């Protein structure tokens, strides 16, 4: 246990500390799960947060004298101490036994630690495949499918989302047994099809790490684990083991009925109609007639809601009852202007797609008709 003298600046830490904060504090299930891992090595500071199944470390350059080592420092206390200091104020840290003395000007704080050995880590491994995808593209991949993930469903498959590759295309699939969200985007590199399943929480930290910067997100796909790299930030997590439902088997086989309209108008109309929907089911009935759309909603309070939309439709009239929360989420994800829908039958799955390009697609399974 050598002395640990940090001499750092706020502007170089507050963003890395925020990034490494993540799913820390909150629910402490056991003490040695710990708060942080601070490591001084080769003029770099590695700050590690964990969740007993996840890990992420931020690297901060040490342009000043340092002492290598590894120890812990409380998450909320350190974060708030660093945040509350004057803008640009320096931080000087010393270690005495198991005590951290943090000094800023004339301000002194004492902090308790735990041995670095007691901290739980993840066993190293040999990476299987690796991607270097641009940040904006990865954000587009995640946002198009994040909402559709299941909420603690018994079918563990639905609790995450799948990333797969075919040559130059990367496909992302999410589902919960009622919704399907698939999005395929170009890569620029060709790698074999090694599907991976990432749990919901891990996807949340993947979203948090992304900052829309020029640095491409690197990812190492393993067998039962995942690693990510954004600049100086490293991340790793476990994986859900199994197989996702075949999306091609879920997508409609005979999308004969076609519809096209404006995303904004449909989203606003569905939001208006969902007010009177059943708060426990959120089911709305859709009647498609010649160049006309009709949405009808009812709730146990016996209130009725009707909305009519101008649309282009060349098929036959059809009735179909489906959830309004799902279509609202789909339209929220779909940020373009014009949206197309493919329908087959009154109890057939409905495909939602961008009119500008195929890009990503969605599937909604109707309610009881």
């Amino acid at each position: 246990g050598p002395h640990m003298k940090f001499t750092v600046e706020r502007e170089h830490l507050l963003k890395p500390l925020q990034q490494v904060s993540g799913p820390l504090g909150g629910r402490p299930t056991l003490p040695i799960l710990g708060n942080l891992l601070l490591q001084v090595a080769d003029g770099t500071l590695s700050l590690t947060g964990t969740d007993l199944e996840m890990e992420m470390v931020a690297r901060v350059a040490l342009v000043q004298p340092h002492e290598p080592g590894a120890t812990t420092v409380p998450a909320r206390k350190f974060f708030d101490i660093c945040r509350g200091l004057p803008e640009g104020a320096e931080i000087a840290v010393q270690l005495e036994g198991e005590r951290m003395l943090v000094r800023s000007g004339r301000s002194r704080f004492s902090l308790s630690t735990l041995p670095a050995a007691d901290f739980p880590n993840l066993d190293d491994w040999q990476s299987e495949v690796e991607f270097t995808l641009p940040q904006a593209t990865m954000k587009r991949l995640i946002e198009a499918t994040q909402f559709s993930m299941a909420h603690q469903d018994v079918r563990y498959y639905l609790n995450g989302m799948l990333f797969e590759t075919e040559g130059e295309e990367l496909r992302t699939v999410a589902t919960d047994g009622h919704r399907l969200a698939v999005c395929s985007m170009p890569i620029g590199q060709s790698l074999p099809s090694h599907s991976v399943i990432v749990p919901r929480k891990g996807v949340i930290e993947l979203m948090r790490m992304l900052d829309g910067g020029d640095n491409p997100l690197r990812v190492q796909i393993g067998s039962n684990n995942i690693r990510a790299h954004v600049g100086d930030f490293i991340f790793t997590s476990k994986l859900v083991d199994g197989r996702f439902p075949d999306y091609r088997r879920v997508l409609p086989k005979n999308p004969d009925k076609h519809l096209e309209a404006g995303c904004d108008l449909l989203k606003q109309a569905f939001a208006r109609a969902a007010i009177l929907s059943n708060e426990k089911f959120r089911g709305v009935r859709l009647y498609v007639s010649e160049n006309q759309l009709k949405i009808t909603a009812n709730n146990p309070e016996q209130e009725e809601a009707e909305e009519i939309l101008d649309v282009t439709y060349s098929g036959a009239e059809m009735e179909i009852g489906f959830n309004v929360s799902y279509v609202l989420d789909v339209l929220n994800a779909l940020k373009c202007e014009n949206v197309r829908m493919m329908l087959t039958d009154s109890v057939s799955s409905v495909q939602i797609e961008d009119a500008a390009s195929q890009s990503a697609a969605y599937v909604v399974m109707p309610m009881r008709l």
């Binding site: 563990y156 039962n224 199994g242």
Partner: protein
């Protein structure tokens, strides 16, 4: 027997099962039937050590690998064990449900997964039924190991699922030699202890190691005092204990030997106590002995089965009913026809 002692009378069966497991011709759910202390725990431990890590030479331990390091330290996460909470006495269905879902969530390390129930007879009905689908269709390379002292007590819907293995008790002479080597006691005491434990050398070793021998000799002295006077109530002082079912079984064994002596059976079970069996034969009629034996067996079963039952009240009632039976002119009970 403190913990997991290898037993020579286990060596044959062991290798046989390995021959089944190594060739990929072993049932996923194997139900071990063995006496208490027969060593089924050691057999299951050795099997799990073979299964759960990198393949060894093909026999013995698994060598010096990550599997052995995690297993010996009890840290391997692919080695699920079902043991009743020490505060409780039975396998809560919540524990089995958690184990089954964790097993459904795929292995963590390389290799197969092993689930071991420390005792099948302690499974409650809900806990027993929570294992039916998992036994019927294990997820992938999942091997179960259930230990029991009698398969009939277990549910019929579970005995169907599991391939049953039988750990036959060792021949009596060999077990006597082994125990005499292990424990320095006279031959008669050794034989009586072995026959008391139905030929289970591990159970006899456990009986000798603890204070059970002192309790048995105290019960013998109390019975010797009580039999001629007819004051059986004093036996309460020796019968009320946490090990009451075992002492009631000892009493039933003494009554069985008394009836044997009345019929003059060439074989007995309390060899080293001829005085007590002679006194019981002399002072008690065969019908009275049979009735007392039936009542004692019934009380032992009621104590062992119904959880939470009060020991003191039952034992006192049994002793008072026996006192009533010893008095002349009292109608004896008969088995429920």
């Amino acid at each position: 027997g403190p913990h997991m002692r290898w037993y020579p009378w286990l060596r044959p069966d062991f290798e046989k099962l390995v021959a089944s497991y190594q060739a990929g011709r072993g049932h996923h759910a194997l139900l071990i039937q063995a006496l208490p202390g027969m060593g089924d725990d050691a057999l299951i431990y050795a099997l799990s050590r073979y299964l759960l890590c990198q393949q060894p030479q093909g026999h013995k331990s698994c060598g010096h690998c990550r599997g052995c390091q995690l297993m010996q330290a009890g840290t391997h996460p692919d080695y699920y064990t079902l043991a009743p909470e020490k505060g409780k006495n039975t396998l809560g269905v919540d524990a089995v449900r958690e184990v089954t879902e964790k097993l459904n969530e795929h292995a963590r390390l390389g290799g197969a997964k092993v689930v071991w129930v420390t005792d099948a007879a302690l499974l409650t009905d809900a806990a027993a039924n929570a294992l039916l689908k998992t036994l019927e269709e294990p997820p992938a390379e999942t091997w179960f190991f259930l230990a029991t002292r009698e398969p009939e007590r277990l549910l019929a819907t579970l005995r169907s699922r599991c391939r049953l293995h039988y750990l036959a008790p060792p021949p009596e002479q060999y077990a006597v030699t082994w125990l005499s080597r292990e424990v320095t006691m006279s031959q008669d005491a050794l034989l009586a202890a072995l026959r008391l434990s139905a030929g289970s050398p591990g159970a006899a070793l456990a009986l000798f190691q603890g204070d059970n021998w002192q309790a048995r000799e105290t019960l013998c002295q109390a019975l010797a005092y009580s039999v001629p006077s007819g004051d059986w109530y004093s036996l309460l002082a020796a019968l009320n204990h946490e090990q009451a079912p075992a002492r009631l079984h000892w009493l039933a064994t003494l009554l069985m030997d008394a009836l044997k002596r009345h019929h003059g059976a060439a074989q007995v079970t309390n060899v080293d106590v001829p005085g007590l069996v002679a006194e019981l034969a002399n002072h008690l009629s065969p019908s009275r002995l049979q009735a007392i034996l039936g009542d004692v067996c019934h009380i032992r079963e009621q104590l062992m089965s119904v959880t939470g039952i009060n020991r003191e009240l039952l034992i006192t009632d049994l002793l008072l009913r026996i006192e009533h039976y010893l008095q002349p002119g009292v109608v004896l009970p008969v088995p429920h026809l």
